[PDB]
Design a protein around this ligand. Structure first.
Ligand SMILES: [Ca+2]
Ligand SMILES: [Ca+2]
Ligand SMILES: [Ca+2]
Ligand SMILES: [Ca+2]
Lengths: 82, 37, 48, 395, 34, 48, 48
């Protein structure tokens, strides 16, 4: 629906089921997106920083952090960590 | 949507202007025209 | 906010890595002066 | 450096403003609400309010410091302040549709909106760590020589200003901040002359601007206007309401109308001015016994705003209005107050220029004058909720 | 007129055509002022 | 005010005395690891 | 205006050049005592 418990601008059902970012807005995942190069993300809907790193789930998924960070650290389950 | 009043990144330039081409005159972004060159 | 120029607290090291990560480096040598540039390049593996 | 400047500016404040600012740090909402609607009372309560000294010293402290250049400010505003009764989006939704954007754009095409209270603003864009209570963001360009008081908070620094102008919105675009859609509006301040409570200052301005106006009138027309405003203004207005020249033409009053119109046209208002007139239900096509005159239930106010706000106006008669806004026993029972902004160069004259009791600082406007209503707000008046209309005179 | 694009308290046409300051207010230049 | 973790200015010495004043200390020795804990205890002389 | 006086950060050097630029210096030399003063003088080349 539209609940956002942790205030990370991703709906709870989106985090629970799967989502991706396009135009800097989270959208529901669809299997046809994988053919266009998109990735499917899931994360903790009760925690703003699922991996415990200084970047929130939205910032990681949207790539709205330092561009020098590796692309695998863009999903919420892999920590950005030197 | 269907108008040139979108600034998604909030940098004072419309999205379609950045997508297609623009120039600055009087400190305001305007649509590019070939006669400007 | 007042329109004055300030340089304290503005560090190029905060941008060196980010610029190097997303750019290509081009150098022109000539004979009396050398020029070094970085130009942004597109990542084709990212649809966004 | 900003913290040092704030400390420097707050050090030179004297004590009374010091506790005023300290009290503002905990009771901001009530002080702002009181300052918004303070000048619509009688002369008694304004001096008798428990917060009048608070507001006076806070206003003095704000007006102590002024800027020498135009500069931009950023703050979040509710769309309801711009006469938009719908919702752009909920606080949990992420995106705004094209339809809501189009409706909001249509609502604010050609209008001016007045802001008349204290406000906390920012000199920097609202980045991370700030608050986003409304889906509307304002980019406002403040004019030169306006009050601005930077004060240090517990951890950060914030700035407070006093709104005494009317703003217009040029362009609106949809932006993204941290995965949510907002509306960013570029607005500009339109200057005007307003005497909220300085009735003495307004009277002095009227004297200085129109005392010599009578000397420019030919003696026959001058005596004509004097005698008419003295005794027969009621009869002339009554004749004008009934569309007298249309039904029963007669030159004995057409000559009066032409003379009054020419006298008003002789000397126009030199600077943008705001005038307050206590209107009646009969003007708005209602009666005292009408159920809609009860502005206590929310339904009546909502219906009145739905059917009247944003529309036009037309007065066949002449309009008499007072520079001051304080209520008087003459119009005590009137629940509607009309706030009119007079554009520079429009016809009109200060009746109170002539000696004697020429009226309650009365100002006359040409017949058939039309107005545009921008927004309507309601303020408490004792045990009843009165109503305020903001209007702009148009040529 | 009254346009001030750079917000420096001097109108655009004044900056283009010539001006001077008296009583801390920019005014249009006139040859008799010299 | 943001989601960032801050450690500067947060000293444990501001809480050591207060924690020790109102708690009992329990230690479990085990074999290859020791555990020390503080558990809050009620003061029966204070009705509040 | 509340009687508080602060002297930290109020440097005289910020005004020495400005005062010396627009003033004339007068010295009175009496017995066992001396006085130096600065008095503002008009500039006749500036109509404003
Ligand atoms: Ca969430
Ligand atoms: Ca989350
Ligand atoms: Ca843009
Ligand atoms: Ca200028």
């Amino acid at each position: 629906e539209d609940l956002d418990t942790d205030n990370d601008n991703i709906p709870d059902s989106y985090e629970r089921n799967g989502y991706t970012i396009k135009d800097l807005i989270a959208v529901k995942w669809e299997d046809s997106f994988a053919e266009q190069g998109y990735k499917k993300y899931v994360s903790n809907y009760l925690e703003s920083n699922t991996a415990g790193d200084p970047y929130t789930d939205y910032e990681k998924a949207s790539g709205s952090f330092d561009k020098a960070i590796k692309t695998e650290a863009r999903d919420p389950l892999v920590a950005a960590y030197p | 949507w269907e108008d040139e009043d979108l600034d998604t990144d909030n940098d004072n330039i419309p999205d379609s202007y950045e997508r297609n081409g623009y120039t600055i005159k009087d400190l305001i972004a305007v649509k590019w025209e070939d006669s400007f060159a | 906010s007042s329109g004055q120029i300030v340089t304290e607290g503005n560090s190029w090291s905060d941008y060196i890595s980010q610029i190097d990560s997303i750019s290509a480096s081009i150098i022109l040598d000539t004979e009396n002066e050398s020029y070094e540039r970085r130009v942004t390049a597109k990542n084709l593996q990212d649809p966004e | 450096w900003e913290r040092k400047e704030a400390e420097r500016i707050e050090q030179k404040l004297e004590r009374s403003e010091k506790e005023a600012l300290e009290s503002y740090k905990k009771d901001s909402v009530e002080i702002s609400k009181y300052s918004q609607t303070r000048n619509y009372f009688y002369d008694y309560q304004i001096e008798a309010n428990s917060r009048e000294k608070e507001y006076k010293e806070l206003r003095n402290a704000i007006s102590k410091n002024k800027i020498d250049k135009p500069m931009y400010v950023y703050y979040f505003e509710s769309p309801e302040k711009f006469a938009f009764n719908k919702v752009i989006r909920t606080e949990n939704q992420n995106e705004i549709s094209l339809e809501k954007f189009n409706e909001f754009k249509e609502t604010i095409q050609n209008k001016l909106f007045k802001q008349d209270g204290f406000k906390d603003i920012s000199l920097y864009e609202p980045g991370k760590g700030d608050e986003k209570p409304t889906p509307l963001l304002m980019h406002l360009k403040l004019p030169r020589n306006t009050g601005m008081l930077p004060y240090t908070n517990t951890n950060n620094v914030s700035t407070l200003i006093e709104q005494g102008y009317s703003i217009k919105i040029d362009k609106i675009v949809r932006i993204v901040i941290d995965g949510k859609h907002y509306i960013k509006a570029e607005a500009s301040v339109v200057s005007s002359l307003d005497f909220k409570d300085d009735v003495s200052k307004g009277d002095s301005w009227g004297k200085a601007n129109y005392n010599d106006w009578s000397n420019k009138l030919t003696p026959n027309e001058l005596a004509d206007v004097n005698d008419y405003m003295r005794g027969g203004y009621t009869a002339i207005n009554n004749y004008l309401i009934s569309n007298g020249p249309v039904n029963n033409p007669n030159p004995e009053l057409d000559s009066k109308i032409t003379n009054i119109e020419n006298a008003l046209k002789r000397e126009p208002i030199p600077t943008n001015l705001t005038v307050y007139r206590r209107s009646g239900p009969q003007e708005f096509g209602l009666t005292l016994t009408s159920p809609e005159y009860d502005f206590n239930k929310l339904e009546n106010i909502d219906a009145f705003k739905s059917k009247w706000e944003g529309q036009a106006l037309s007065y066949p008669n002449f309009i008499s209005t007072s520079i001051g806004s304080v209520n008087m026993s003459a119009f005590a029972k009137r629940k509607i107050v009309l706030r009119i902004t007079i554009p520079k160069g429009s016809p009109g004259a200060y009746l109170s220029a002539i000696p004697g009791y020429a009226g309650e600082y009365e100002v006359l406007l040409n017949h058939g004058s039309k107005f545009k209503i921008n927004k309507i707000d309601s303020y408490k008046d004792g045990t009843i909720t009165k109503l305020i209309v903001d209007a702009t005179l148009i040529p």
